[PDB]
Design an enzyme around this catalytic site. Structure first.
Site, PDB file in Angstrom:
ATOM      1  N   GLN F   2      85.129 -10.982  53.496  1.00  0.00           N
ATOM      2  CA  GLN F   2      85.079 -11.951  52.405  1.00  0.00           C
ATOM      3  C   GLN F   2      83.938 -12.975  52.610  1.00  0.00           C
ATOM      4  O   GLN F   2      83.576 -13.278  53.747  1.00  0.00           O
ATOM      5  CB  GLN F   2      86.419 -12.686  52.344  1.00  0.00           C
ATOM      6  CG  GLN F   2      87.346 -12.253  51.216  1.00  0.00           C
ATOM      7  CD  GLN F   2      88.772 -12.715  51.439  1.00  0.00           C
ATOM      8  OE1 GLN F   2      89.360 -13.480  50.664  1.00  0.00           O
ATOM      9  NE2 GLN F   2      89.386 -12.215  52.478  1.00  0.00           N
ATOM     10  N   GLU F   3      83.400 -13.517  51.505  1.00  0.00           N
ATOM     11  CA  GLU F   3      82.337 -14.546  51.450  1.00  0.00           C
ATOM     12  C   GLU F   3      81.131 -14.294  52.349  1.00  0.00           C
ATOM     13  O   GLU F   3      80.801 -15.106  53.212  1.00  0.00           O
ATOM     14  CB  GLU F   3      82.873 -15.998  51.553  1.00  0.00           C
ATOM     15  CG  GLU F   3      83.999 -16.315  50.581  1.00  0.00           C
ATOM     16  CD  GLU F   3      83.820 -17.397  49.533  1.00  0.00           C
ATOM     17  OE1 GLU F   3      82.681 -17.595  49.042  1.00  0.00           O
ATOM     18  OE2 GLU F   3      84.854 -17.971  49.122  1.00  0.00           O
ATOM     19  N   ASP F   4      80.460 -13.166  52.102  1.00  0.00           N
ATOM     20  CA  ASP F   4      79.270 -12.734  52.824  1.00  0.00           C
ATOM     21  C   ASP F   4      79.489 -12.366  54.302  1.00  0.00           C
ATOM     22  O   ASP F   4      78.514 -12.330  55.061  1.00  0.00           O
ATOM     23  CB  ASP F   4      78.058 -13.680  52.616  1.00  0.00           C
ATOM     24  CG  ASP F   4      77.476 -13.751  51.205  1.00  0.00           C
ATOM     25  OD1 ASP F   4      78.034 -13.090  50.291  1.00  0.00           O
ATOM     26  OD2 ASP F   4      76.453 -14.472  51.016  1.00  0.00           O
ATOM     27  N   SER F   5      80.739 -12.043  54.718  1.00  0.00           N
ATOM     28  CA  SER F   5      80.930 -11.528  56.072  1.00  0.00           C
ATOM     29  C   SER F   5      81.073  -9.999  55.986  1.00  0.00           C
ATOM     30  O   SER F   5      81.182  -9.468  54.879  1.00  0.00           O
ATOM     31  CB  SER F   5      82.069 -12.223  56.822  1.00  0.00           C
ATOM     32  OG  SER F   5      83.330 -12.218  56.173  1.00  0.00           O
TER      33      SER F   5
ATOM     34  N   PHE I 480      79.882 -17.183  54.808  1.00  0.00           N
ATOM     35  CA  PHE I 480      79.648 -16.665  56.147  1.00  0.00           C
ATOM     36  C   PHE I 480      78.352 -15.872  56.274  1.00  0.00           C
ATOM     37  O   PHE I 480      78.244 -14.987  57.115  1.00  0.00           O
ATOM     38  CB  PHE I 480      80.916 -15.992  56.712  1.00  0.00           C
ATOM     39  CG  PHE I 480      82.206 -16.709  56.337  1.00  0.00           C
ATOM     40  CD1 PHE I 480      82.499 -17.965  56.849  1.00  0.00           C
ATOM     41  CD2 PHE I 480      83.094 -16.151  55.429  1.00  0.00           C
ATOM     42  CE1 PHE I 480      83.688 -18.625  56.506  1.00  0.00           C
ATOM     43  CE2 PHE I 480      84.265 -16.826  55.059  1.00  0.00           C
ATOM     44  CZ  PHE I 480      84.551 -18.064  55.597  1.00  0.00           C
TER      45      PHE I 480
END
Ligand SMILES: [Mg+2]
Ligand SMILES: [Zn+2]
Ligand SMILES: [Zn+2]
Ligand SMILES: [Zn+2]
Lengths: 49, 112, 107, 143, 97, 134, 84, 171, 502
Positions: F2-5, I480
């Protein structure tokens, strides 16, 4: 008029070495306004870089 | 009316971007610019040139030119601003520090 | 009050504060064509008495310094002929409380 | 009298290294294992070119030499460059300075090395003072 | 790390008076000076060992206090002094309001 | 993820996916401070040397260098140097405290004017971990 | 000047800040081996002890509530309503 | 001289003492701190008067900490010496430089030079004495001194004094 | 630590700004400062009874600080003075000085206007110390004559005499650090046409200021106690102690002095020069030439960024860091050392999300937990637990780094020979590792929100990243893609409460 005493080699030698090294494109260790960042260290992270 | 227009204007800038800020926040800003009797700007000229403490004014933008004038005018900073107590490294008079705490020997001897 | 069409010479203007305790006011006829007080954005200002003021300051533990200030030249301060020291009570509508009372001291 | 010490106090040894630590600092003895001050002095962090100065003869100060493009020096450049050029006449200013400037000209021309090229010029300033049968010729002690 | 201006603001917004004081003092800068009660200056020759106090020039060996301020302020104050300005520090008030 | 990981196949990472070599080079000069004062390459002794690094000096051969092949670690002393002034202060080079690895190569040279100076290469292999960007 | 108890006009309820500061202060004192005014029903954390003391209003502290003029109203923790 | 002075001391009591023997501990701590004390402003704070009526007042609870602070208003007997004050005292020490005189809580020292010329130092005595043509001044002798000046020194006040002028000296 | 002083601990309640009276500058000073030499008793290793510690502050891990002793980590550093040859302008006022001359008589020292002028008595009435000075000036600047007699407070026929002196007032203009007047004149009623053009000396301005009435100067900004106008022109120079201008002694042929120590030495040299000139046969124009050099060095020391004037440069071509410039910008002493500063008990790393953390918790890498510490007081409640973490030591996770005795001295568990057999005492402090459920301040910069800094529960975890619950992403404004976040650890029971409770 001794030639070696007349012409100071260090003038042009270290004068260019300074610019290229530091990057303040001008004369010399008394630089401002001189434009810093004209000469810089080549990025060697990747070939494309 | 200057206040009402100034709010209207501020409100528009926020709501134009499709954002919501509760009234009170904009109201306060609008009021602060107002209270003096005119249009006191949020600039080195406006607010920062009021009768607040000298160290407070100096923490924003004019620093040394404010402290020299502070000297020749023999200003006295009453240290009520948050800025002052921060510079001084003391507990600021804000929320938690807006009141004082005392032990009462009466109530103390009552519980035992 | 002296309602003038275009101007009052600086010769004549020098006679304005010449006869106290009586007071003189100059109003340019052109300003008065429209009553500003009637405007949407212009709330009810009410001039307080010496006793009313004294009470305000007593009730809020204030110095005249601490009160928000109406400027002497303010369109409404002019309309009400407010003098330096005089206090107004502004009654505005609130989207928050319905009615909000603010006070302004004269400059 | 200046006495400076870090002796632990609890178990005086008179005396031993206490550590410089890595992060915590304060030099706690590996003996009483106590503290001494807080340190808080980074010597590695010297003033770079970005103020530091490495003087070899007396003490360097400098004056004037204005060139900041804000307001043109023109009239004021000559006002101050003349005024500082008057002052280098008060108390035998010339001598060491003349010697070190003429020194860097004679060496640079023959391309003498700076690290030890400058070292000998310090020797001259020690030889120009002291009065031991110099029969000084300027050129002579320059060789 | 830097507990900077914008972080000071959040703490002021929270009402974390003591948390802020700690960040700025205990957790960083914090220092102790001795000041004079007459001229609120850092003049005091505290020979705290022999328990001698003195602020010569005031001839005050009596009216002396101790304060806890961030060393940068002790610095700032010494700096303002060097520049002929007097930032006299007083431990009591005289104005009211 | 999630969120660019992102999630990585830990199995693949073991097989060599995204590993990389890493080489840092530490340098040091043996400077000459005028007519008398000269820095020295050597293994400092803690009795006659001030302000020693808490790190260990044992990995130094008597020339003041670690031989290439020795494994190093944080705070350890790659290059031993002293700046005699009087007996002498410690001017040694320790490996960065946040890193470690094995010494790859070590070279000794003189420069344009002939100051002894030494370059040390340190090799590590960086195997894709958590906060690693891709 | 100090406002008389019969003329106090601030909230009869304890502010978030007051409560946070009382709990902070007691916990600090409890932690500096101060005498505890409650049965610790096995409690060991000074904040959880503080919470317990405030829960039974056995905290011997008073809030000096300053007014912008400089005057003040003193309020006992025992007397302040804890609706937080 | 020897005054009765109205004074007040702020005491910071830890919560653990907020029991009924609070006033008792306050009145006690007051006496520990104040009694015996020597200040420049007030001199020697010797004895706190009227124990039974020491005004404790209401203690304000210090906010972040637990503790309460009270301004204990009291009244005590003080001894503040002055220059020009003529005092009677007993000799304590005596040397080639002069002699110290004990005046209640404090010692006043008399220089060989701040005495008449006739009075001269006699080392050859047990204990060492000062001898006049008529008088003998030693360790037990009673002397009337004129205080020349005082030095406020920490936990004491010391002074220099003469016995050279009229109506001074041995008693 | 820092040793005990019997002095009463108090808080600063008021700050009383003012100017330094030369009398006071002299009175504070603990050294004369006579020589532009740093230390080096001619090629030595001790400070010279002349500049830095002539009697002054102490440095170099050595007590010697004039009886005061203490040394570095206690000594604040005390001031020296420098006696200036001739008065010079303080660069900052130069204009307030000019304005004061513009308001007063340059011969008798009396306000050009008074109670007799109506506009004046009106402006004089102004309560605001600055606004009244502002108004007084715009009025008095214009007045170019000290009047002897002015029309009475009734009739303009019978003129009442105020203060004497009939003298014409110069038209003052600045020529960078210098104030030059242009007297109106009279000559056959006309003249100027060509007036009297002379520079007003510091000494003459000083003298007029000395003669300005207390009532008069008090009507201007000035205060008879803390800021007399005579105190704006510098006569004595407070010399700051080494703490304000640190030196560093590298390797016997390398030594670094602070720009101020340089700038001071120039002031001194320029001073010593001008003193010798006045003493000797004063060549008038060779003296005022040396004075306006001194004027420059003193001026450029407080401010090097002066408009119109050349900067003082330091060999390498870089301009001298004046005092002004150290306070000024962001990164100044104000914006960057006081209003915001770096701190200890701080930690920073790459953030990553976690569906298995609770909203209010924060994943803390073991290494970060093993570094950050909480000082816990030894108490009956924790004594046994604490003794165990002490036993565990600095390397094991739930362990500790230091033991703080009542005595004040810190025990380093990493090296203490007694790190094993350490027997705790109530009241001591154990500096233990950060542990699961400790309240900590978590922050994502910029920080344009109170929600950009929030209190989380610790959760010590493996791997080098700070883990956060995904729903808490939005307030911080984190993702992230390579974002890092800041962690601050409270050190007091009070501070912790603040975090957890607010
Ligand atoms: Mg991002
Ligand atoms: Zn003083
Ligand atoms: Zn000192
Ligand atoms: Zn005159």
């Amino acid at each position: 008029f001794n030639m070696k005493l007349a012409i100071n080699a260090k003038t042009i030698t270290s004068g260019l070495k300074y610019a290229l090294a530091t990057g303040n494109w001008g004369e010399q260790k008394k630089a401002m306004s001189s434009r810093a960042g004209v000469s810089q260290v080549l990025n060697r992270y990747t070939y494309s870089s | 009316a200057g206040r009402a227009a100034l709010y209207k204007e501020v409100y528009n800038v926020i709501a134009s971007d499709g954002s919501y800020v509760n009234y009170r926040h904009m109201a306060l800003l609008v009021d602060v610019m107002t209270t003096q009797g005119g249009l006191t700007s949020v600039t080195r000229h406006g607010f920062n040139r009021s009768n607040t403490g000298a160290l407070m004014r100096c923490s924003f933008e004019e620093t040394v030119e404010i402290l020299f004038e502070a000297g020749a005018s023999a200003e006295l900073d009453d240290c009520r601003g948050v800025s002052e107590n921060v510079i001084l490294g003391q507990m600021a008079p804000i929320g938690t520090g807006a009141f004082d705490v005392m032990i009462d020997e009466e109530s103390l001897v009552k519980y035992m | 009050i002296f309602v003038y069409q275009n101007n009052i010479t600086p010769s004549a203007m020098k006679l304005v504060p010449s006869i106290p305790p009586a007071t003189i006011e100059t109003f340019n006829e052109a300003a008065l064509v429209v009553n500003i007080t009637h405007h949407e954005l212009v709330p009810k200002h009410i001039r307080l008495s010496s006793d009313e003021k004294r009470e305000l300051l007593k009730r809020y533990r204030l110095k005249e310094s601490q009160l928000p200030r109406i400027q002497r030249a303010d369109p409404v301060a002019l309309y009400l002929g407010l003098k330096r020291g005089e206090v107004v009570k502004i009654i505005r509508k609130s989207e928050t409380s319905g009615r909000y009372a603010s006070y302004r001291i004269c400059m | 009298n200046l006495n400076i010490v870090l002796t632990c106090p609890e178990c005086k040894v008179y005396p031993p290294k206490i550590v410089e630590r890595f992060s915590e600092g304060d030099v706690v003895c590996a003996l009483c294992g106590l503290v001494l001050s807080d340190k808080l002095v980074d010597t590695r962090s010297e003033w770079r070119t970005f103020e530091a100065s490495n003087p070899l003869l007396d003490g360097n100060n400098l004056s004037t030499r204005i060139g900041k493009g804000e307001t043109t020096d023109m009239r004021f450049t000559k006002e101050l460059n003349k005024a500082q050029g008057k002052n280098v006449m008060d108390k035998k200013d010339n001598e060491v300075q003349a010697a070190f400037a003429k020194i860097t000209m004679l060496c640079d021309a023959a391309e003498l090395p700076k690290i030890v090229k400058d070292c000998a010029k310090e020797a001259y300033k020690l030889c120009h003072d002291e009065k031991t049968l110099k029969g000084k010729s300027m050129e002579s002690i320059m060789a | 790390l830097r507990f900077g201006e914008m972080e000071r603001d959040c703490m002021i917004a929270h009402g974390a008076a003591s948390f802020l004081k700690e960040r700025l003092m205990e957790a960083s800068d914090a220092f102790r000076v001795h000041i004079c009660g007459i001229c609120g200056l850092m003049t005091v020759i505290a020979k705290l060992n022999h328990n001698q106090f003195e602020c010569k020039g005031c001839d005050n060996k009596i009216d002396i206090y101790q304060i806890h301020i961030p060393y940068a302020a002790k610095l700032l104050f010494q700096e303002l002094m060097a520049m002929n300005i007097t930032p006299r520090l007083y431990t009591d008030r005289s104005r009211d309001f | 993820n999630q969120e660019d990981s992102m999630i990585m196949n830990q199995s693949s990472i073991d097989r060599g996916l995204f590993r990389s070599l890493f080489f840092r080079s530490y340098m040091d000069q043996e400077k000459k401070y005028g007519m008398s004062i000269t820095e020295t390459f050597e293994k400092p002794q803690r009795t006659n040397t001030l302000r020693m690094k808490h790190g260990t000096y044992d990995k130094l051969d008597d020339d003041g260098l670690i031989a290439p092949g020795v494994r190093v670690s944080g705070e350890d002393v790659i290059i031993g140097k002293t700046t005699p002034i009087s007996s002498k202060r410690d001017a040694s080079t320790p490996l960065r405290s946040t890193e470690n690895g094995i010494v790859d190569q070590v070279l000794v040279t003189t420069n344009q004017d002939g100051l002894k100076f030494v370059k040390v290469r340190v090799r590590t292999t960086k195997i894709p971990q958590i906060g690693d960007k891709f | 000047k100090a406002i008389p108890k019969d003329q106090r006009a601030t909230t009869p309820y304890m502010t978030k800040y007051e409560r946070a500061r009382i709990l902070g202060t007691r916990a600090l004192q409890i932690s500096m081996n101060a005498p505890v005014f409650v049965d610790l029903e096995g409690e060991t954390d000074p904040l959880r002890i503080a919470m317990k003391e405030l829960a039974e209003k056995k905290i011997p502290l008073v809030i000096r509530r300053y007014l912008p003029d400089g005057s003040f109203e003193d309020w006992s923790v025992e007397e302040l309503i804890v609706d937080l | 001289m020897f005054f009765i002075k109205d004074l007040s001391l702020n005491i910071t009591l830890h919560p653990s003492f907020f029991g009924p023997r609070m006033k008792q501990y306050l009145k006690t701590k007051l006496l520990e701190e104040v009694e015996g004390s020597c200040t420049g402003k007030f001199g020697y704070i010797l004895c706190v008067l009227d124990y039974d009526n020491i005004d404790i007042q209401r203690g304000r609870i210090l906010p972040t900490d637990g503790s309460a602070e009270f301004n204990v208003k009291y009244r005590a007997v003080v001894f503040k010496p002055f220059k020009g004050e003529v005092v009677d005292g007993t000799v304590v020490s005596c040397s080639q430089h002069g002699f110290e005189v004990q005046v209640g809580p404090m010692k006043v020292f008399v220089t060989k030079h701040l005495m008449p010329q006739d009075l001269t130092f006699n080392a050859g005595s047990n204990p060492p004495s000062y001898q006049s043509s008529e008088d003998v001044i030693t360790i037990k002798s009673r002397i009337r001194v004129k205080i020349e000046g005082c030095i406020s020194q920490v936990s004491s006040i010391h002074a220099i004094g003469s016995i050279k002028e009229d109506y001074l000296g041995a008693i | 630590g820092q040793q005990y002083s019997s002095a009463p601990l108090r808080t600063v309640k008021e700050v009383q700004f003012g100017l330094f009276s030369p009398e006071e500058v002299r009175a504070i000073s603990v050294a004369k400062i006579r020589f532009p030499e740093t230390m080096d008793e001619t090629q030595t290793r001790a400070k010279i009874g002349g500049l830095n510690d002539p009697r002054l502050g102490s440095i170099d891990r050595n007590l010697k600080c004039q009886t005061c002793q203490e040394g570095m980590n206690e000594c604040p550093g005390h001031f020296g003075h420098i006696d200036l040859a001739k008065p010079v302008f303080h660069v900052g006022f130069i204009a307030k000085i000019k304005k004061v001359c513009e308001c007063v008589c340059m011969h008798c020292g009396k306000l050009l206007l008074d109670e007799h002028n109506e506009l004046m008595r009106q402006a004089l009435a102004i309560k605001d110390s600055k606004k009244r000075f502002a108004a007084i000036w715009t009025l008095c600047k214009t007045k170019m004559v000290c009047e002897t007699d002015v029309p009475s407070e009734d009739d303009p026929t019978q003129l009442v005499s105020r203060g004497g002196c009939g003298n014409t007032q110069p038209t003052i203009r600045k020529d960078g650090l210098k104030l030059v007047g242009s007297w109106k004149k009279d000559r056959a009623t006309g003249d100027a046409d060509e007036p009297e053009l002379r520079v007003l000396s510091t000494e003459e301005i000083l003298n007029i200021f000395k003669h300005i009435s207390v009532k008069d100067f008090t009507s201007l900004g000035f205060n008879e106690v803390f800021s007399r106008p005579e105190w704006m022109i510098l006569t004595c120079l407070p010399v700051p102690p080494p703490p304000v201008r640190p030196s560093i002694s590298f390797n016997e042929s390398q030594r670094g002095e602070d720009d101020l120590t340089f700038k001071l030495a120039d002031i001194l040299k320029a001073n010593i020069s001008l003193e010798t000139l006045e003493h000797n046969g004063a060549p008038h124009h060779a003296i005022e030439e040396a004075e306006s050099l001194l004027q420059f060095h003193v001026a450029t020391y407080m401010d090097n960024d002066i408009a119109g004037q050349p900067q003082a440069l330091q060999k390498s071509g870089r301009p001298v860091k004046s005092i002004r410039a150290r306070l000024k910008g962001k990164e100044g002493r104000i914006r960057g050392n006081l209003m915001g500063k770096r701190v200890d008990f701080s930690a920073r790393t790459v953030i990553s999300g976690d569906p298995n953390l609770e909203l209010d918790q924060v994943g803390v890498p073991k290494s970060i937990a093993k570094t950050l510490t909480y000082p816990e007081v030894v108490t009956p409640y924790n004594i046994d637990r604490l003794t165990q973490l002490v036993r565990n030591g600095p390397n094991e996770h739930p362990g500790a780094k230091y033991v703080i005795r009542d005595s004040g001295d810190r025990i380093d568990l990493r090296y203490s020979k007694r790190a094993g057999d350490i027997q705790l005492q109530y009241g001591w402090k154990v500096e233990r590792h950060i542990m699961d459920n400790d309240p900590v301040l978590f922050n994502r910069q910029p920080s344009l929100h109170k929600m950009s800094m929030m209190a989380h529960r610790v959760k010590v975890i493996p791997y080098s990243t700070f883990r956060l619950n995904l729903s808490v992403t939005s307030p911080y404004n984190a993702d992230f893609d390579g974002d890092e976040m800041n962690l601050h650890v409270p050190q007091s029971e009070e501070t912790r409460a603040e975090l957890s409770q607010l």
